[PDB]
């Protein structure tokens, strides 16, 4: 009559316990999951997940739903991924590196500079 649901994100847990029914917005349409549901992996739309224990509702920005007859895992995302947002962040990171580097410089100095700082860092302790 109940399964172990765990709603988690790359940063922290969102929910963990025992549930009666899990309602999710899959990439192809709404779902209603209950104990013993067959194994199922699915991509989630940005929207609210409704759980039955009493009733709970949590807003998620998308993710992956993994189901097994004795376990339900929701791998949520902290932000809403998308082709424009996904590409913008890459262009800003590239732009940052263009502005940072002007030209090449002496690279053989690495070893000498590292030895200088390795000797200097010992005297301090």
């Amino acid at each position: 009559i109940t399964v172990h649901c765990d709603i988690v994100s790359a940063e922290a847990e969102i929910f963990s316990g025992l549930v009666e029914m899990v309602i999710a917005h899959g990439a192809l349409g709404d779902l209603g999951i209950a104990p013993g549901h067959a194994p199922l992996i699915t991509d989630l739309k940005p929207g609210p997940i409704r759980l039955v224990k009493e009733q709970e509702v949590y807003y998620i920005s998308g993710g992956f739903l993994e189901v097994q007859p004795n376990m339900v895992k929701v791998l949520a995302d902290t932000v809403v991924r998308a082709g424009d947002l996904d590409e913008a962040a890459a262009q800003e990171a590239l732009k940052a590196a263009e502005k940072a580097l002007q030209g090449k410089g002496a690279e053989f100095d690495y070893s000498a500079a590292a030895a200088r700082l390795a000797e200097a860092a010992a005297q301090l302790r």
């Binding site: 790359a10 990439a27 192809l28």
Partner: protein
């Protein structure tokens, strides 16, 4: 750096990109799921 203990920080390099009787009910195509999950995995390792 990796946290060995409160008194020891270890500098490290970790490889990111180059990594039983039943099957899942894949709603979307399996390529789309694997392509998306490998990206989420690498980002999570960088965040950790």
């Amino acid at each position: 750096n990796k946290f060995v203990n409160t008194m020891t920080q270890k500098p490290t390099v970790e490889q990111l990109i180059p990594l039983h009787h039943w099957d899942y009910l894949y709603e979307p195509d399996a390529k789309s799921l694997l392509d998306g999950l490998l990206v989420r995995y690498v980002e999570s390792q960088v965040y950790q």
